Symmetry: D2
Subunit: 334 residues, 4 copies
């Protein structure tokens, strides 16, 4: 079917001066955290997946007040995930199937994704996403301040290639059974120049030569056992230094680290707060799955409630952010 | 140099009637093995990587005689791997860097890949490869009788999507630390229809809708420990049946099953031969890394010797194939 | 970077109403071309579009007359986006929409399509000269009738283009008065051709056209004007000799008015007299008309041509009334 | 599907020798166009190429004379791949290379590029009429001189094309004899244009050309022939009035021979007499020549035109010897 090239969307939705400045400055600010120049905590927080732009904008408006309130302690960036990896089969996200009905209206999905990202940046909320697909990034990447390569794709050479040409900092996740070495290896790969095939803004395949991404880091997201605690952070930092890459890392509160209880995210955050208060020198960030309303649902019946992984709700989000701000204020003073 | 689209190569190197027939029949023959309709053993055998077409053709000519000799017991298909996944960085194969000098002459690489595959199929030798890149398959897939998705990419949704649209049977490998469930999950994914972005024969990005691949199976290739033995095969078969997919599987002699020691492939093959002789009902295939000359080398100084993973040499190859043919002859008679 | 036709089609898909109007107008014109209906096709409007707002106001006025005269006249607006220059100069709204030498062709194509969609949606079918080879994929679906210009009628690439258009096409006599090139052009464009063109996705491709069975000639003057009965009669003889339709269109403007917009009425009066006496070979006329008469070098005055001089709105009413009255009589015979 | 230019360029890259010949020939011709050298450019060869074998044999014979006469004549072969028809008919080797209505354009472009590369590699530069808008990207790098035809000289899209070509371009007078269209064409093509075209990758794009400073006119007859001293003198006055080069080319064939190949020699003799008397405004001639004289509808006889009738090889030797002798005298004055 009849795919519009990136230039069609760029024409309708050009990046504004304000969005461009926010992206540029947020990428910079994050690089500073990755390389230990600033001790604020990056907080990648928001829905597991975007399925409704209206709810995402309402969430963003609430989060913006806290982004501002905590700006001396936290760098808050919203989760705006358009692409979802499934264990076998399922809904792959807003771009692949925006109408949530198996119509796969990808032209509409890319348009809606770009539109939402532009609105978010224009209101002052920077955005993050997982880069899963090889061809979709040309459509919206200019609006992304931080990227994840997922646990299921961190070992993949084509994903490492992709990351090597992205202009935002990138977090590589440990593997789904807990293998951290694949993410450490991934920084090594993505930091170098690569030559590979990719698709241009005009929608044509081409040979690209990337310059390498100097702003990669790992993310601890659990495996067979969770890996959030001080012992695990310390072990990861040793391995990072041994490989000659940044020993500043991010901890995902959700997924394998919270296991089967989405409310465990608060426990993980409390453990992280305690680390920050004792020492926590190797922590530069955290990820939290948060929405307007807690939990999850198979069908999009309740407004502001995840249709993918379960999330904490708004009230818990306030507590979690206050907790982390208070703890990091102390780390920063020390 | 701009990227030539698939149609340029197809124009210069159209598939012949003979090649087309060999591919069609070999794919069918393999499907029969995958689904338990024939008890011959698929043997995916040849170099770790192709770096010299002249040596590959000489290898193929030798292997053809054994392909014919053993055709009632074994279905022999050559390893013709053009794309290599690296742990961090390194030579990614003949397509990416055909001159082996960091010039990345991908147009020449794709041409040379297609030319070699056409010559192989024309001489009567079917071909196999790992499908790693998303855009390169349109150049040569029509000449491939069996595909692998690698241990490092089996969990990747974009690779499962790719496999779902391939016209050849596909083997998914267990993960690098030994996780089999990701390959079982991968069959589940790739057997279904997907919608995703891909590039057309004219070199333009497009939305593709695949029909699913009914001929996927798993490959046991070792993890932290090898997984070739009867116990492991039996456990894998139970898990396959539980997931409702084919419980016929393939066993890689090389890689983590030989602990990266080419001299151990024969031991693995002997264990497999013993399984076939005792029962071995769930085995439909094996993989072997084999070349004209054993071992490996960093620079392509010695003719017919691998520059990637170490391989057994031609003499050991004869013993290994005779061993497997004799063992499977007995299984087939039972 | 040039956006492909599909980008514009996505933003501005043809509506059911526009699609029906185009389809039916093309049919109606085919009927005139082949002598099945005796209404007079009237291709009327600005020499060139340079301001969509004025074009929409003009269209709204013309629509009332299109409806009023529908039993005698088939009124279709001139919506010309591409202009052939003698040497160099402004080539039209698509090539340079901001009229300042910035050549914002993406904006120009968008604006052309948008205007054409709005016109068809309001009930006013559109005509244009097809000059460029690649631009038609952007808006052709919204055009009910096309012209191949005097300067391009003899060109094989223009005859190829016409052969694949889904609308009727008028070919003009050459700039010094040669009619045979337009007769030859019908011959060419009526047949199937294979040639290179660009797809809706913006890629070059081999196209195989089916031929255009609805082509006709247009008399637009040469060294001397050619609109009179004698000239029409001579043209019709030549058309029959070549085995093509002997129903033709007469341009009031250009070489036939000797570039004097005040003479278009005189030409129309001559045509009216032909229709009243006999005028069996006439199926249409062209008139260069705008809100305000004359022309100007710079787009200072609203609704006034920046290319060839046009008659104004008041003269347009008189001219259309004149032609409707004359053709009512022809049709009654 | 249509292969983009890059596919053909990959298989048939221009050689160093071909590249040098093209570069130097274009410069040599520019020198003639602007009156810096008094050699006579001779564009000579088949009306159309339909068989590459015969073209290469022709070229080998012509090369000897190219060399022999190099101090008096600059000989460039006619290698025409695109033909304008009066109505319908075979459009040339690119459009239908198998001459059977299969329209194998991919094969045609390949064969065109291959022949041009072989010709340049053997030392014979090439000329062609540029008719089609998309084909030139495939082979233009191998062309030393281009014609815009009589039927397309007035066409703005052809003037745009010429403005971006890297070779000198001759514009022909119109088919009824109008020279002003070609003079106007130089004015147009010498300026910068913006328009749509297709890239080497096969995608449509906006191009901005720099203008072509090496354009000139070609006298090719009209209703009457226009090759004589009086006509040359009158053309030169008009060229100076328009501020463009008053050095022109004279086509021996077409309407100057009244479509009679046996009259090309008479025209050449008239031109020779002009060169001997004065003939200061003449920089070139065109001649339709093949291995064997005449024409045929089907390609039955080897080396005989299937389009316009040509003189044969023997007559070609006489004609070249005549022009060399005459120009040797002009150059000595
Ligand atoms: C799938 C994912 C996280 P991971 O790649 O760690 O499983 C997510 O944020 O939804
Ligand atoms: C890298 C590879 C196999 P695996 O994907 O099991 O590591 C190979 O055949 O070279
Ligand atoms: C240039 C033109 C008409 P023609 O092609 O008869 O000169 C026009 O309608 O503006
Ligand atoms: C068609 C042509 C010349 P002209 O464009 O003067 O009619 C030719 O050389 O074949
Ligand atoms: Mn999640
Ligand atoms: Mn290997
Ligand atoms: Mn006009
Ligand atoms: Mn000719």
């Amino acid at each position: 079917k009849e795919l519009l090239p990136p230039i069609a969307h760029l024409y309708e939705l050009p990046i504004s001066k304000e969005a461009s400045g926010l992206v540029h400055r947020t990428r910079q600010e994050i690089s500073d955290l990755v390389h230990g120049r600033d001790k604020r905590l990056l907080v990648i927080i928001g829905p597991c997946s975007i399925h409704d732009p209206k709810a995402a904008l309402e969430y963003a408006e609430r989060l913006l007040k806290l982004r501002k309130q905590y700006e001396n302690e936290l760098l808050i960036v919203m989760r705006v995930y358009f692409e979802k990896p499934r264990t076998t089969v399922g809904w792959k996200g807003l771009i692949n199937d925006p109408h949530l009905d198996g119509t796969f209206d990808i032209n509409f999905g890319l348009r809606q994704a770009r539109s939402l990202l532009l609105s978010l940046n224009n209101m002052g909320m920077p955005a993050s996403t997982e880069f899963l697909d090889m061809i979709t990034p040309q459509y919206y990447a200019d609006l992304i301040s931080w990227g994840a390569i997922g646990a299921r794709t961190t070992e993949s050479q084509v994903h490492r290639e992709l990351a090597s040409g992205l202009s935002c900092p990138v977090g590589f996740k440990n593997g789904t059974d807990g293998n951290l070495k694949i993410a450490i290896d991934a920084i090594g790969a993505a930091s170098h120049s690569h030559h590979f095939l990719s698709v241009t803004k005009a929608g044509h395949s081409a040979i690209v030569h990337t310059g390498g991404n100097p702003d990669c880091h790992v993310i601890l997201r659990g495996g067979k056992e969770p890996n959030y605690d001080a012992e695990h952070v310390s072990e990861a930092a040793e391995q990072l230094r041994a490989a000659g890459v940044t020993d500043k890392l991010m901890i995902d509160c959700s997924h394998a680290n919270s296991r089967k209880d989405y409310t465990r995210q608060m426990e993980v955050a409390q453990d992280i707060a305690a680390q920050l208060e004792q020492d926590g020198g190797n922590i530069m960030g955290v990820m939290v799955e948060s929405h307007l309303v807690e939990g999850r649902q198979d069908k999009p019946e309740v407004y502001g409630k995840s249709i993918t992984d379960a999330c904490i709700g708004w009230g818990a989000t306030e507590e979690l952010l206050a907790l982390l701000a208070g703890a990091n204020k102390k780390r920063m003073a020390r």
